[PDB]
Design a protein around this ligand. Sequence first.
Ligand code: NA
Ligand code: NA
Ligand code: NA
Length: 326
Amino acid sequence: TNHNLHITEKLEVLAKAYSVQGDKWRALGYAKAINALKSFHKPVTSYQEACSIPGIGKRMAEKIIEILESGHLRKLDHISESVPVLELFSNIWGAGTKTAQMWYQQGFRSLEDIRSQASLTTQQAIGLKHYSDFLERMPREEATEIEQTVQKAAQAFNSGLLCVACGSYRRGKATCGDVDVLITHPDGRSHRGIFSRLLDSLRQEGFLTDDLVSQEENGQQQKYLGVCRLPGPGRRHRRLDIIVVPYSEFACALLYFTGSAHFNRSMRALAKTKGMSLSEHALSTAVVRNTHGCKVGPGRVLPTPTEKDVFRLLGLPYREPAERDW
DNA sequence: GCCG
DNA sequence: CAGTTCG
DNA sequence: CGGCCGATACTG
Ligand code: NA
Ligand code: NA
Ligand code: NA
């Protein structure tokens, strides 16, 4: 489908540069310009042919031009030398742009430096320990094995439990960055305080290797982010994210967890324009917001039994998971 | 960065 | 709280 | 001018 990879290749480099340096809004700007150019059909050929495209402005158009003319972007040759390092550091799970910039300011330039001299949080030490594994995707077939593993351990103590793999898996991708397992129960209450049992069952069989986010000393735990590894030879550590939700929030939870991320954001931005609000918990109407668009009035939750209801309530035609990459 |  | 993370 | 998703859910 990519009819502009010549340009949406030089821009991505610029986009990730801005992202790692912390200029998040400018990076979001570039992401959309790129997220669009790709979705095009014909290779842009005119400054006017560019502007006409949503997500592209005069500034972006100009840069697009210099490429379809200079085959290069002068900007890319003035990118700070720190960027590759910031990117290297930022790819450690648990370390964001603030930690990357700090480490760099402190003279660190490689993972070696980070390993031997950086002060690491428990999450970052886990992230560094599986640095290569966290950058690899897995065949969807393996994701299936992981979901099945969790579902089996979950239904083992309550067969009523509904378990579904979401994210890229549900969107039908060939490979998955991690496994997103959503768990809920049709009765509306049996899903309470199950984490304790599930996580222990999984730890028992040595399936879980590391925990990244798991507030277990509190019975109100909603999510778990960790590392698991199927048994046998040739197996790599994989990221596992599990959320347990009340049946009444099932649809919204499923929509959220299925993504994509940019899809969720667009849909939520849409809800806001209609005086509504969408979250992994619910779709609300009559929401009261202030001048800066901040939620200052809860409004009321709308009945959303299925994903279709959410789309319907927002005045949108339904979309199968596979059609939600953006 | 884009857009209203 | 600031940072980072999930989709 | 100023928002860009969510009153993310955790961590320390
Ligand atoms: Na990171
Ligand atoms: Na995922
Ligand atoms: Na914990």
